[PDB]
Each structure stands twice: as C-alpha cells, then as structure tokens.
C-alpha cells in the first residue's frame, strides 16, 4: 500500500484565497476593497499565483470581465505575458486595454502578433498592426528553430493576416502554399502540419475567388498579369482547389465550346461529322488562315476533335499497317505505301515534341509523365526509321526469313516498330480527361499506379530470392541433348530452372498458371531434390498468388478510399490543363509544313471588394458557428443589468 | 471469494492509478510509472481474459500521457536531458524496451535521432543516389582502413551511423550478388566429392561473420526478447542451414572420389542433400533483405502492413489446412484401390502425364495443394475402368474442394485482410517510426565491420528533477486550460455574467 | 523581416465607439441619449459603419433586441 507524498509545488495561503474567490466569482466591491491594501501592507503580493498557476488578472481575463481587468491595471498588477493570455482567449476588450497601458505558458519565441494570427481573429490582428507589430522572415537548438519556423509560417498562413496585409492575397497564398509544400518534404517530419497549412492556403485562395458576383470581376481576376495569365500561373502552382471552382469552370467551358449547343444522338453525329472533315478544315486553314473557315480550327473544341481524329486515323492506318492486302520477306525493306503515309504523322509528332520541349526548357516538362511517354515513343520511331535506312542499304539478297540471322537489322527494326506503336496506340488513354464519365476513373488509375509501383519493389526481390533458390537447386540438370526446341516458351516444357534468366522467366510466368508442374522433374531418381524443388516452387506460388496479390488489392482498396474526397477536384484540374493546351498557336494536327495602370487599378478595386466580402463571410459565419445563442444570452443579461442599475 | 468484487476492485484501483493527474501530483518520476504501469496493464489485458478492452484502453492512455509529457519540451537541451538519462539514450532504450511506440514516434525525438543518424548527409534524388552508391562502392576500403587505423583518419565515417548502414547494406547485397554468381556455368562438373569452388571460399568469410554476429547478439540478449524477435528466428534458421551445408560438404568431401555421373547417384546422397540445404539457405538469406525496408519513407508502412496481415493469413492457414486434410481423407479413401503403376517410367503428379494422383495420402495432399493454382488437369479423376459412379463422385468431391478453396476461403481471406488493414492505418506511421527507430538504435554503438571480423549523477539527477518539474507544470497548464475548457467555455462566462450582476444588485442596497 | 502596412480600409472615430459600445452591450438609456443628437449635430452620422462593416442597426438585429431596433427606426 503506497504511502506517497505530493510532489514539491508552491502552495497558496488562506488569506489570498478570500481575495481569489471574489476574483473568480466576480465582485467589483470586495475585489477593490482587497485592493485597498496598496499603501497598507496586508503582507501579501496581490499577484501571487494559486495552485492553478494563475494570477487574478488571468482569471479576470478568463471570465471576460473587463472592469476587474481595468481595476487591476488601474492598481498596477504585474502582467508578464497577460497579453498573450488575452489574445489566446480572443477577448477583444482585454487586448484593447492591455495595448493601451520564472514561468511561461508560451514558447518565448512568440511575438504577440504570431499567436494572434494563430487564433485567426480579425480585429485583434487589425489593432495589432495599427500598433505596427512586425513578424520575422523565414530564411543550435534544432527544436526551437523548427518550432520557431513552424510558428511563423502558421502565423503567416492565416487568412486574416493575408486579408489585412500583403497587397495581392492571391500571390501570397500561391507562393506560400508552394513553400509549405516544399517544406513538407524538406523538413522530414512535420509533414502533416505543413501539408495542412498548405491545404488551408489553397482553400483560402479558393474562397476569395468564390466571392465574385460578376463575370466581369471574374474575368478581371483570371486575365491578369497572353490571356488567362493568372489562371496559367495557378496551374503552375498546383492550385487545384482554386481552378476546380465552378465559375472558373463556366468561363473555361464558355471559352472551350463557342457554340457546341442537346442529347447523345445529335452530339455524337455532329462530333463525327466534324471528325470526318478534319483534313478539309486543316488545308483550308493553311491556304487561307482567315475568317472563311479557319475560325473553326481557332475554336478549341473543334481543334480538339481534329487532333483526336488525326491521332486515331494514325492509329487506324497503323492497324492497317500489317494486313496481307498490302510486302514479302526479303532483306532490304524499301518501305510500303503505308510507311510513306506514316512518316508525315511521325514527323509531326517530332516537331510537336521539339516545340513543347523547347518552350518548356525541360523543367516541368520531363516532370510530366506524358512527355516521357512521347519521348520513348518518338525515340523508338526514330530508331525504326534509322534501322530501316540501315537495312535498306547493304541488303538485297531476298533470302528467306527463316534463314536469317538473329539480331538482323530488319528484324530489330520491326520489333522496335511494334514496341513503338504499342505506346502510340496506348497514349490514346490520355484523352480521358475530356469525358465526364471516364475522367475520375482514369485519375484513380494514375494514382493507384503509385502503389502498384511499391508492390513491384517487394515482389521483384521475392522473385530474385526464389530465383536464387531454384537455379542453385537445378543448374546441375542441364538437359539439352536432342531438344530441337529449348527453354520454357517451348511446346514441351524443357529445362526451366537451368539458367537464372530462364528461372526468372519461369517464376514470372508461374503466376498466370502457365508453368505446368512437370518442370520440377529431372531425368534421374533424385526424388529428394525434386521434392525440394516442388516445395520451394509451391512456396513461391503461395507467397505470390494468395499473399502478395491480396495485399496488393487491400492496399489499392484503402488507397482509393483516401482519394474520393478530392476526386472531382483533381479531375477538373486535369481537364482544365488539357483545355489550356488548346487555347493558343498550334492549329494543324499533322499538316505541319497606361494600358496596365487601368488594369492594375481595376484589379485593386476588385481585390478590395473581394477581401471585404470575404471578411464579411468570415465574421458573420465562423464567429457565429453555439456562440450564436450565447451572444443573445449575453445581451439578455447585460441589457437587464442596465435596466436594473439605471432604474435607481 | 467474490471473484466479481476482486476483479472490479483491481480494475478500479488500476484505473485510478492510471490517471494523468495522480501521476502528476505523485510518483516522483512520471515516466517510469507510466512505462511500468502501461506494461502491467498490457499484461493484465491477456492474463485477465475478458476486460481486455478496458485494460487495453488504460494502457493506451498511459502511453498517450507518456507522449504528452515529452511533447511539452521547448528546448533541445531539455530533450537531451530527458532521453539521455539512467551508455547514452538510456531512457530511449528503456522506452524501446517497454513498447512505448507513441512515445518514440514523437517528432522532436525523431529530430534528435535523425541528427544522430545523419551527421552531414546533406538535396534531391540524383545527388543522394550518387553519393550513397559512391559510398557503397568503397565499403572494403573504409572497413580495412578502420581496421588498420581505428582513429580520426577515415574511420569516423564508419563511426557515423548512416555510412555504416550503407556499408552493411552493400556488404549484404554483395554477399547476395556472389550468391547469384554462385551457380553460373562460367565457374564444377558433376562428381562425388565437392572440393568447393573459389566462390564458396569467398562465401565462407561472410557466413562466419553472420555466425559471430548472431552469437554476439544472442549472448548479450540472454535469449529473452531475442527469440521473441522474428528476425532472430530467420537468422537462426539461415545460419543453421549454412552450418548444415558446411558440415555436409565436409562429409561429402571425404569418402567420395568416384566421379561417377550424377544421374547414376543415389537418393539421399550427401552432396545432393548439401546442395538442397544450400538452396533452402540462400532463399532465406536473399529474402531477409526485406528487413531493410524500415529505412525508406515510402516502403516502410507497406511492409508494416505486410508483417501485420500475416497474422491473419496465419489463421486462414489453420482453417484451410483442415479443409485440406478433410478432402484428402475423402479422396484417398475413394481412390486407393486404383494403384495403376504397371509400366509408368514416370510416376506421381509432378509427371508430364498426370498419373495416379489420389493414390497415397501424400500425393493426395500434394494434388489438392496444387489444384488451387490451376495445375491439376482434371483427367486425374479417371481410372482405367468403367466405374463411372466412383469417377463421378471423385470429380464431385474434387469440385467441392475447388469451390470451397477458390471462391469461398480465398474471398474470406481477402475480406478479413481488408478490414484488418482498415483497423491499422490509425497507428501506421507510429509503428513505422518505432521500427525505423529501433533499426537506427541497432547502429549507434560497437560493431563497425560488416564482414571483416578478425557527484557525476547528482548533477544529472538534479537537472532531471528540474526538467520534470517544468514539464509537469507545463502539462498541468495544458490540461487545465484545454480539457476543462472544451461547451463549458461560454458557460463559465454565463456564470460570471449572472454572479457579477448578483453582487451588483445586492451590493446596490 | 517584413515591415508591412495595413491595406487601405475605412477607420472609425473614437467618438462613435462610445455609441457602438452601448449598442453592442445593449443599453436603452445611453443609446437614446446618444440619439438625442438628431437636431444637435454631434458631427457624426449615427449610421456610419465600424471596421466590422456594421451599422448599429445591424448589431441590434444581431443581438435580437427589439427595442433598440424600434428606437433606431423611430429616429430614422
Ligand atoms: C474500338 C474501341 C473499342 C476502342 C477505340 C477507342 C476509341 C473508340 C475511343 C478511345 C478514346 C475515346 C475518346 C475519349 C474521349 C472523348 C472525349 C469526348 O468529348 C466529350 O465527351 C466532351 C463532352 C463535354 O464537353 O463535356 C469526345 C469523344 C472522345 C474523343 C472519345 C472518342 C472515342 C475514343 C477515341
Ligand atoms: C534488382 C532489384 C529488382 C532487386 C534488388 C533489391 C535491391 C535493389 C533493393 C532491396 C532493398 C533496397 C534498399 C531498401 C532500403 C534502402 C534504404 C535507403 O535509405 C533511405 O532511403 C533513407 C533516407 C532517409 O534518411 O530518409 C537506402 C537504399 C536502401 C538501402 C535500398 C537499396 C536498394 C535495395 C537493397
Ligand atoms: C506461406 C506458407 C507457404 C507454404 C508452402 C507450402 O505449403 O508448400 C506446399 C508443398 C509443396 O507442394 P509439393 O512440393 O508438390 O509437395 O506441399 C507439400 O509438400 C505437402 C502439401 C502441403 C500443402 C499445405
Ligand atoms: C459450396 C457448394 C459446393 C458445390 C459443389 C459443386 O457444385 O460440385 C460441382 C459438380 C462437380 O462437377 P463434376 O463432378 O465434374 O460433374 O458438378 C456437377 O456435378 C454438375 C454441375 C453443377 C455445377 C454447380
């Protein structure tokens, strides 16, 4: 049975408890009568703390009673950090007095405006900047440095401070969300904190835009420094909540259509009717880039249909590029009619890629995955062209293909051509950020690939582990006498686990039910080694098929549960930047052969209105909610107070 | 006597003793009392069989309290005085010992650990990758210059924990690389009597390094909370198979020099069993490169999820195994009179033609194991007779097994793994940072070479009591001004507005 | 270190703050006594807004007090 003693802590006398009880219960008579002991020493310091760690001024701030605070400041009680205690409770009547005059409850690296910005109260920061309180700039104790930077970034990222200062709130919200996103990764461990601050900066940048009540105002916001320059800068800073704002999407859709209007039949027939006439529109744009017909190609939806039709007819005459209607098997290609039709599409992709890589300066270019896919596609196309040039010279024997060598240039050219047009047919998947139905699903595709690419780091070393086991167990069994056909691609499954390469290949194909279990026998009577080979092959089949695959579907399941809160936002951001890719000036798909002082004035006026509206929508909403009925209670008490005292 | 009043009496006094306010006002070191009390409540979660939610919640609140005391440090000097208290990091080692994973996934503890761990690592992926592989290409240079001169010349690199982690990682993967190399046709023909290769003579001063390393960490752990780590079991089976491989190659090296062809050898010949045990050894040695995944930020929590959902795969492999033995009891009983082996140069079910599958119980178990992968090709159920009823019942109770295995138990397995992973992502990063913490603690002492193994307290107790007094005072403040507040915050203002007006009225008379 | 200035926004005088404090705290005596400056010009418009964007009628609606609303509508 523990007979323990209280830890050492300072204890209050009983003669100050009669003072503090009147402080907490809230007198003005008896508190002042106890405060008549200023000249007459009643052997006590009136600011000496209780066991709760409070001076009486902290209670009078804690109970919102302005007149006890006024009394104690009139009789010169020691404040210390009473200003920060008042600011943390966001009592305005205390702070308006305390501005007008060892232990801390706060980190000493806090200036009075920083925790004011942390509390996100408008008028407290508004009266502190009237006193001119400066915040430091975020350029020994790795604790105090980190929490100091975190405090001043969280203070600088409040909506009220960006409202009252920082002349363009859009730029400060954008750059500050960028810097917090950078420090999420650089500072390795407060990534929830920095991530949440960057997210609140993004929500603030959205909610400023949400307050526009005129489309003229919205145009003055987005077209500000050709056009849509602030929207281009918003795409640049990954402000995806800002650009999935609805009215921005109405302005973008009104830009995008330009008389598209219906129902599915009329829309389908008009889209395919435009798509059957894309070379007509492109060549009449080239012979006359004027207001005759080329206004169609200037419209973004119609040039999207034209690029889509040109890309899928490139795919159609790649589908056509292997039929038996069109060459026999000889060394020396002398390319087809179809290859001569292919070449002024591939060269158009070469020119298009060189242009968009030149005007992006390889930065945030290669950072797009589709530029990597274009790069490998066009590299394989150039290698195909070069290898067909090499095979066109020096080879005219017309010897039969079955008698050719391995690594002959024609065969490698045809293989690289197939590896090229699998990619060229595959990146028709990137037009799915235009349909309303197929968009978010391919966003989910592109995001759960980022966890499939973690299971393909676990699974590959599981693979190499079992390959190290199996080839070590079977490499003495090299049965190849006879054997016109070898390997594991054979009609009869030959010696599978002989080399490490065929071993890796075998264990890859065993997860599809294609390695048919007599690979584990050898022509011997070595039933122990055969049994251990079957046992450690079954172990691999278990770990692959019923463990790692099911962990893969569980990880993809909850990783998709994480995303549907921000699904439509990311989809509208993607279809936005796809739409921004069709507003300039690159019309043909494959047929490639003062003035600011007024605008700055109007922009400052619209920002003044938007900030005023947002301050209104913050005060009348977030202050309300419940404090809404509590303020009515305070009114019903105070009004009756003045009814009573004024009656006398 | 009253097993009710005894149980609720103990539960009440543990719940009373596990409050934060009582540990604040008493119990001179609150860290030790929170730690030992969380340990005792975790024990009584299992020993007392039924109030495991209650005892578990009390232990969790003790862990949160031990975290929130540490969260109040506002100086890195204070944090150092907390963690380095009784070589160094002794309280942190004791916290790892008591499974205080919320305590050690505190952020500022992780900053102090990372500042210990790097010692000038600083960038971006290209520079970090090239510098890591540049260090990793030079590990025997660094190790042998540590051995010839363990001083401030160059061995300060190996004293740094990140660089010795890179050196151990590079040595372990070059052990794996010259195990990958240990089967190529470039390097012996098939004879009884190995006389081991150049590669085996290179293997042996890695395996002996693992032997010495395992003996050291098993000796200084006293086999308790040693074998309780799963990786020590994996090291134990790995090194046991290696020693069996060495011993069997010694046995085969003597008494055998016939050079007779391998196809004419016996079954259970010592060379063949040695090579099989060597393969079963290096599957494990290549496989426990998976345990370096508590160092990457991306691969960490995923392999934590691996290691935790294995604990339910290991329940379906108790249900599924008796389903297996049930259908084996059915099928071998139905087919053991059909023992067709006349002719049959090749037998069994590993054969090119699927022979008599369900004859013995062993081949039956083997058949029903392989049938869940689509590898038992359905003509195993015929026999050379016209017994179409028994053939049909064999196919019927084989299809019943295929249904129960493939579309029932596998889907129950994915449903159980699904919600069992839904239970864990509230405490995912905490467990990952705890794991990478104890991996980092494994590289702070003193074992530098990876394979090349050939009063003074009264001041500190005074400062520790002062820091505890400040931390307890700060925590009592952060409890009073927060949890008492929240709504009672506006209610206390209402009480003020009523009572102050009361004294305004009565004092007016 | 950013030495910044508050954005341009209209600021309230101190002689109307003594009026608005009685409006928010909820008098009928002193609010009407401040509203005795209808004929006698006390150099202020009584409907001039605070930094919160409110006229005093909006506070009296915001604090549910019908008689201050009746008073302000009675004094136009
Ligand atoms: C033969 C089939 C099985 C495979 C061949 C694929 C094509 C038939 C599909 C692949 C992508 C599809 C495109 C995906 C997206 C769109 C966007 C769509 O535009 C809209 O729906 C926008 C409507 C809006 O403004 O909201 C026009 C059709 C189009 C080009 C689709 C046209 C038909 C395409 C080329
Ligand atoms: C050939 C491939 C398909 C399989 C071979 C596997 C290796 C290439 C992988 C397996 C584990 C990997 C290791 C997993 C974890 C790390 C931790 C990583 O350290 C960090 O990232 C720490 C960064 C930080 O301080 O936050 C250094 C690379 C390393 C050793 C990786 C190096 C590459 C390894 C050895
Ligand atoms: C994660 C656990 C991995 C389990 C690996 C495993 O079960 O191997 C199955 C082994 C491998 O099958 P065979 O080698 O063909 O017999 O099966 C048996 O030996 C008997 C049937 C026993 C069937 C269970
Ligand atoms: C948990 C329920 C288990 C059900 C087991 C089962 O369905 O056995 C299928 C049986 C087994 O297939 P066979 O024996 O090859 O005919 O199929 C039939 O007999 C007729 C087709 C009927 C197909 C349904």
Q: Which ligand is nearest to the CA of B379?
A: 4
**Is any Cβ of chain A less than 8 angstroms from the Cβ of B407?**
no
What secondary structure letter does DSSP report for B442? T
- Please report all neighbours of B, defined by 3+ CB atom pairs within 8 A: A
Asked whether A235 and A576 are in contact (CB, 8 A), the reply is yes
How many other C-beta atoms are found inside a 10 Å radius of the C-beta of residue B201?
9
- Of A133, A225, A217, A292, nearest to A612 (Cα)? A217
Instruction: Tell me the two tokens of residue A356.
Output: 């968009």
For residue A102, give Cα distances in angstroms to B70, B460, B477: 21, 21, 15
Q: Do A165 and C6 touch (CB under 8 A)?
A: yes
Report the candidate in A173, A179, A122 with the shortest Cα–Cα distance to residue A149.
A179
Q: Which residues of A touch B26 (CB under 8 A)?
A: 4-7
Indicate yes or no: CB of C6 within 8 angstroms of CB of A126.
yes
User: Whole-angstrom Cα distance, residue A326 to residue B84?
Assistant: 81
Query: Is the sign of the CA dihedral B328, B332, B334, B338 positive or negative?
Result: positive
Distance A583 CA to ligand 1 centre (A): 20
Neighbouring residues of B296: CB distance < 8 A, sequence distance ≥ 6:
none
Measured in angstroms, the resolution is 3.6
For ligand 1, the distance from its centroid to the CA atom of residue A279, given in whole angstroms, is: 19
Question: What residues contact residue A17 under an 8 Å CB cut-off, 6+ apart?
Answer: A50
Q: Rounded to whole angstroms, how far apart are CA atoms B345 and B356?
A: 13
Q: Is the distance from the beta carbon of residue B171 to the nearest atom of ligand 2 less than 6 Å? A: no
Selected for mutation to probe chain A from B28, B74, B124, B351 (highest A CB count within 10 Å) is: B74
- The torsion defined by the Cα of A496, A502, A507 and A508, in degrees rounded to 10, comes to -130
Of A331, A287, A297, A238, nearest in space to A573 by CA: A238
Q: DSSP states of A227-242 as a string?
A: -SHHHHHHHHTT-HHH
Q: Whose CA is nearest to atom 6 of ligand 1?
A: A428
- The closest alpha carbon to A90, from C3, B493, C25, belongs to B493
User: For residue B357, how many C-alpha atoms fall within 13 Å in the half-sphere facing its CB?
Assistant: 26
Give B74-124 as a DSSP string.
--HHHHHHHHS----SHHHHHHHHTT-HHHHT-HHHHHHHHHHHHSS----
Virtual torsion, Cα B200, B203, B209, B211, nearest 10 deg: -60
Shortest alpha-carbon distance between residue A383 and chain C (Å): 56
Q: What is the DSSP letter of A37?
A: -
Ligand 3, atom 20: closest residue by C-alpha:
B366
The CA distance from B6 to B24, in Å, is 27
The closest of A13, A472, A529 to B284, measured between CA atoms, is A472
Q: Are A275 and A305 in contact (CB under 8 A)?
A: yes
Neighboring chain A residues of C52 at a CB cutoff of 8 Å = 122-123, 619
For atom 6 of ligand 3, the residue with the nearest CA is A539
- Centre of ligand 3 from the C-alpha of residue B369, in Å: 7
- Of B369, B370, B373, B405, the residue with max ligand 3 atoms within 8 A of its CB, to mutate for a pocket test, comes to B369
Query: What distance lies between CA A594 and its chain's CA centroid?
Result: 39
Q: For residue B493, give the nearest of A25, A64, A492 by CB distance.
A: A64
**The ligand 3 atom nearest the CA atom of A534:** 14
Alpha-carbon gap: A623 to the closest alpha carbon of chain C (Å):
12
Chain B contacts in chain A segment 423-462 (CB below 8 A):
451, 454-455, 457-458, 461-462
At B65, list the tokens: 């309290």
Neighbours of A1 (CB within 10 A): 3
A425 CB burial (10 A radius; 0-12, 13-18, 19+): middle
Instruction: From residue B506, give the alpha-carbon distance in Å to each of A24, A34, A623, A646, B509.
Output: 18, 19, 35, 15, 6
Helix (H/G/I), strand (E/B), else coil: B36: helix
Residue A460: CB within 6 Å of ligand 2? yes
User: Is the separation of the CB atoms in B83 and B76 below 8 Å?
Assistant: no
Q: How many CA atoms lie within 13 A of A440 on its CB side?
A: 11
Identify the nearest ligand to the CA of A254 by its number.
1
- Cα A188 to Cα A186: distance, rounded to the nearest angstrom: 5
Ligand 3 nearest atom to the CA of residue A542, by list position: 3
CB contact, 8 Å: C55 with chain A?
Answer: no
Cα–Cα dist B207/B200, whole Å: 10
At what angle are helices A169-186 and A191-209 packed, to 10 degrees? Answer: 160
Comparing CB atoms, the residue among C5, C26, C52 nearest residue A639 is: C26
Technique employed here was cryo-EM
Name the residue among B278, B277, B274 with its Cα closest to residue B192. Answer: B274
Q: How far is B288 from chain A (nearest CA, A)?
A: 9
DSSP label of B168: H
For residue A269, is it left (φ>0), alpha (ψ between -120 and 50) or beta? Answer: alpha
Q: How far apart are CA A548 and CA A540, in angstroms?
A: 10
Please name the residues in contact with A312: beta carbons below 8 A apart, sequence gap of 6 or more. Answer: A428
Establish whether A130 is an annotated binding residue: no
Separation between Cα atoms, residue A119 and residue A83, nearest integer Å: 13
Residue-wise over A106-119: b if at least 16 C-beta within 10 A, else e? eeebbbbbbbbbbb
Residues 106-145 of A with CB under 8 A from C: 122-123, 126, 129-130, 134-137
Distance CA A432, CA B315 (A): 43
Measured in degrees and rounded to the nearest 5, phi and psi for residue A538 equal -70, -30
* E-only strand ranges, A197-349: none
Retrieve residue A615's tokens. Answer: 């301050």
DSSP notation for B388-402: HHHHHHHHHHHHHHH
The Cα A312–Cα B154 span in angstroms is 62
With a 6 Å cutoff on the Cβ, whether A397 touches ligand 3 is no
Q: Which ligand is nearest to the CA of B398?
A: 4
Give the Cα separation of A494 and B348 in Å (integer).
18
């Amino acid at each position: 049975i523990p007979l323990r003693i209280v830890r050492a802590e300072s204890e209050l006398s009983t003669q100050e408890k009669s003072y503090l009880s009147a402080v907490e219960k809230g007198d003005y008579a008896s508190v002042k009568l106890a405060l008549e002991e200023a000249e007459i020493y009643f052997k006590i310091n009136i600011n000496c703390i209780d066991p709760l760690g409070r001076t009486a001024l902290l209670i009078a701030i804690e109970n919102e009673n302005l007149e006890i605070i006024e009394l104690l400041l009139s009789f010169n009680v020691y404040v210390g950090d009473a200003l920060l205690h008042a600011i943390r409770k966001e009592v305005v009547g205390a702070v308006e007095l305390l501005l007008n005059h060892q232990f801390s409850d706060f980190t000493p690296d806090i200036t009075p405006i920083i925790l004011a910005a942390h509390t996100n109260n408008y008028e407290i920061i508004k009266m502190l900047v009237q006193k001119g309180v400066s915040v430091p700039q975020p350029h020994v104790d790795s604790l105090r440095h980190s929490r100091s930077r975190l405090n001043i970034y969280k203070a600088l990222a409040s909506p009220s401070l960006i409202a009252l200062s920082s002349e363009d709130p859009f730029l400060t919200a954008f750059q500050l969300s960028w810097e917090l996103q950078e420090l999420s990764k650089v500072e390795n461990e407060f990534k929830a904190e920095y991530e949440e601050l960057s997210h609140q900066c993004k929500h603030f940048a959205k909610d400023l835009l949400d307050q526009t009540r005129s489309s003229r105002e919205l145009e003055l916001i987005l077209n500000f420094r050709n056009e849509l320059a602030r929207l281009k800068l918003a795409i640049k800073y990954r402000q995806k909540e800002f650009v999935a704002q609805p009215n921005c999407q109405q302005l973008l859709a009104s830009r995008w259509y330009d008389e598209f209007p219906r129902h599915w039949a009329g829309k389908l027939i008009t889209c395919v009717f435009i798509g059957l006439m894309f070379p007509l529109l492109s060549l009449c744009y080239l012979v006359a880039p004027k207001s005759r017909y080329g206004l169609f190609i200037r419209k973004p939806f119609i040039k999207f249909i034209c690029h889509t039709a040109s890309y899928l007819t490139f795919l159609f005459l790649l589908l056509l590029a292997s039929q038996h209607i069109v060459n026999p098997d000889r060394q020396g290609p002398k390319p087809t009619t179809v290859e001569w039709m292919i070449l002024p599409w591939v060269l158009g992709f070469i020119w298009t890629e060189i242009k968009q890589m030149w005007d992006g300066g390889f930065q945030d270019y290669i950072h797009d995955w589709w530029n990597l896919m274009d790069f490998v596609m066009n590299s394989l196309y150039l290698a195909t062209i070069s290898l067909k040039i090499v095979a066109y010279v020096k080879y005219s024997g017309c010897k039969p293909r079955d008698t050719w060598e391995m690594w002959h240039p024609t065969l490698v050219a045809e293989a690289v051509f197939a590896i090229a047009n699998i990619f060229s047919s595959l990146r028709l998947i990137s037009l799915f950020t235009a349909n309303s139905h197929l968009g978010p699903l391919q966003i989910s595709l592109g995001r759960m690939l980022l966890d499939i690419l973690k299971f393909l780091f676990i699974y590959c070393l599981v693979l190499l582990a079992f390959a190290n086991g199996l080839n070590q167990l079977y490499f003495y069994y090299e049965n190849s006498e006879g054997m016109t056909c070898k390997g594991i691609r054979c009609e009869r499954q030959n010696n599978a686990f002989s080399t490490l390469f065929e071993t890796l290949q075998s264990l890859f194909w065993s997860i599809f039910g294609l390695i048919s279990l007599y690979v584990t026998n050898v022509k011997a009577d070595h039933k122990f080694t055969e049994f251990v080979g079957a046992t450690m092959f079954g172990t691999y089949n278990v770990i692959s098929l019923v463990v790692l695959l099911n962990m893969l579907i569980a990880m993809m399941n909850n990783s998709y549960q994480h995303i549907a809160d921000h699904a439509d936002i990311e989809w509208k951001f993607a279809r936005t930047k796809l739409w921004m890719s069709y507003f300039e000036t690159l019309p043909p798909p494959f047929n490639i052969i003062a003035e600011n002082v007024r605008l700055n004035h109007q922009y400052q006026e619209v920002l003044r209105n938007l900030v005023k509206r947002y301050v209104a929508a913050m005060i009348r909403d977030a202050k309300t909610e419940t404090e809404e009925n509590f303020k009515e209670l305070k009114q019903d008490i105070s009004s009756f107070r003045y009814e009573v005292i004024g009656m006398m």
